[PDB]
Amino acid sequence: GSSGSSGPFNSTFADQEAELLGKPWYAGACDRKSAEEALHRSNKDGSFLIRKSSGHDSKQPYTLVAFFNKRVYNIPVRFIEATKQYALGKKKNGEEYFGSVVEIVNSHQHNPLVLIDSQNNTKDSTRLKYAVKVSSGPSSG
């Protein structure tokens, strides 16, 4: 947007990717559907996986997907450039401000992440315990 612009001129997020590639939870640029599948197949309330947002995204760099008892919750991981921090879901009257995406997982690992499904009002949090990363494979087709 204001800072971002055509060309690699501004490649802030990229740097973060370096510390994301390889992670057993980093779904990468894998199809959204696949992300859910890999989760539904797990069947272990607590699994998670970060899936890179659409191409040329700023406000929404990545998105966290915490799998629950036969359920899938994909919360948007907005990035407050103002302070270069990260947050979960839309803005709130005192949302949590992290330094990076990895932190959201590290801190969560121990701290519970309330899953307030706007649609299904069900207060049920869970501390990241499992890491299910989706993968298509080398064979394209």
Instruction: Give the Å distances, CA to CA, from 93 to 1, 11, 13, 21, 97.
Output: 25, 30, 26, 33, 12
Residue 25: which of 45, 52, 43 has the closest Cα?
Answer: 52
Domain, as residue range, for 44: 25-132
CATH number of the domain enclosing 96: 3.30.505.10
Q: How many structural domains comprise the chain?
A: 1
Q: What is the DSSP letter of 117?
A: -
d(CA 134, CA 130): 13
| Domain annotation covers residue 13 | no
Structural tokens at position 100: 């990076």
Residue 2 lies in a domain: no
In terms of residues, how long is the chain? Answer: 141
